[PDB]
């Protein structure tokens, strides 16, 4: 109901629970002509310009960082489990917007809600169409990996000496190729990884066991967030607005 | 895995995005004979008090705020959608925690926190354990209630003539008899009401189309809530910790 592509920029976003997609503030039109090569139409009043090629499709090696989550006592040989994380980024969009037509379900409810102000009906207004709106967002496709490590010196000698075989491929490969030798000879470590947002074939680092196509980039990350009360014009409902949301 | 009833309070709780149970920071014991009647035996650490029988069953009927969530244009005669709540609350216990011993899990990674401040180690920490402990907690067997309601005078209608005609019975009780009158001769009004917490036979105004007695009290509201930061006792990680805490 009231969904398309790019998307969540339209449904608002509720900034205590983080949660998006609740209410609709504006409306979805379709006169004005935003569109994007290989895709539908998209609403109006955003405005999409994907990232440069230079970021277009980039893959970070975090630092290795200590296993804490499924460690839940001091070893000198054994670890301190060490994880790895390898983010990479694919098909990514900025999304703006300038300039939104606004919806009539939503001032109307200003409107009611404007007239008199009361405690209970803001609070639930704020349940209801969150309490912030978006401005700008990342979308894209994310490739997010975690490397687990039974010890400390394991990922170091294995950092230093894949560090000397490719001093012509990076690291997660080659790691991933001497991870099939031990298939052969038998050790016990396992890669996890998962991905936001189906991952096109134009970049290498994302490919999975086949390949996709141009797929729909899934809303990676956030940017600039504007309140919701600055948009109501009078200040009966402005104080009511940001004094009902700081109880909660 | 590691769960008990009350249950909660041994998990943490974080904040920014109000989850619970994540990590364990104290160790659920049962030396201490912390007994409450009918329920078996609790973790240790913690202190449970009944509420008083004065608001040991309570019916708050909240007042009657417009429906905004359905409506997403002005009219005289029609609404103005109502809705109403009526939220009653049984078998209420307070939780404290008088004295806690501490995990060793917890303290262990704790240490390994302690002696080396990190900045993607700590986020992470906060990700897994949250970011503070809970000190007080209400749990309970909670039914709420909502009614929708087509127009503005037809709530206040039934608020004034069902106060001429209670003036031995509540407000709801009655509003359910005249609503199974019109199902006898037909009108498209609906109510909606859901519990959290199974409700006892103790009380009256929660009883449901069976009965039920000496239910397992869910987790109903918070009460007071202790940060983490404080019980690691060195600055060179309390700075780091509060300080992380502000980026997201
Ligand atoms: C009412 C509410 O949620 N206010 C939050 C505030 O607590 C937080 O520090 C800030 C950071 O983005 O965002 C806003
Ligand atoms: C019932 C409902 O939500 N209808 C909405 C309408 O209010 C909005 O103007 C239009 C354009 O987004 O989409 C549809
Ligand atoms: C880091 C964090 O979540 N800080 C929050 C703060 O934003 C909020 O105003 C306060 C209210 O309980 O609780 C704490
Ligand atoms: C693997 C694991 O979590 N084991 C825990 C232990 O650390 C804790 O001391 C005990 C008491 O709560 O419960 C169990």
Redesign the interface.
């Known amino acids: 109901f009231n969904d398309t592509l790019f998307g969540e920029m339209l449904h608002g976003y509720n900034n205590?629970?983080?949660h998006v997609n609740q209410?609709?503030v504006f409306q979805m039109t379709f006169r004005e002509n935003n569109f994007i090569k290989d895709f539908p139409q998209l609403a109006d009043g955003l405005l999409v310009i994907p990232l440069p090629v230079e970021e277009q499709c980039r893959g970070v090696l975090?630092?290795p960082?200590?296993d804490?989550?499924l460690?839940?006592?001091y070893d000198e040989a054994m670890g301190?489990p060490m994880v790895q994380?390898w983010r990479v980024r694919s098909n990514l969009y900025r999304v703006k917007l300038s300039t939104i037509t606004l919806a009539a379900?939503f001032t109307?409810?200003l409107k009611?809600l404007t007239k008199e102000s009361?405690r209970?009906?803001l609070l639930?207004?704020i349940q209801?169409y969150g309490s912030h709106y978006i401005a700008e967002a990342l979308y894209g496709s994310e490739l997010t990996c975690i490397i687990h490590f039974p010890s400390k010196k394991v990922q170091q000698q294995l950092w230093l000496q894949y560090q000397k075989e490719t001093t012509s491929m990076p690291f997660i490969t080659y790691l991933s190729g001497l991870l099939t030798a031990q298939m052969l000879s038998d050790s016990g470590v396992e890669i996890r990884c998962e991905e936001k947002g189906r991952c096109p074939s134009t970049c290498h680092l994302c490919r999975r066991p086949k390949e996709q196509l141009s797929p729909t980039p899934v809303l990676l990350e956030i940017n600039r967030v504007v309140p919701l009360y600055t948009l109501i014009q009078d200040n009966g409902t402005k104080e009511a607005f940001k004094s009902a949301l700081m109880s909660s």
């Open positions: 205590r629970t983080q209410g609709q975090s630092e960082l200590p804490l989550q460690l839940t006592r301190y994380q379900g109307n409810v009611i009361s209970e009906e639930s207004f209801h």
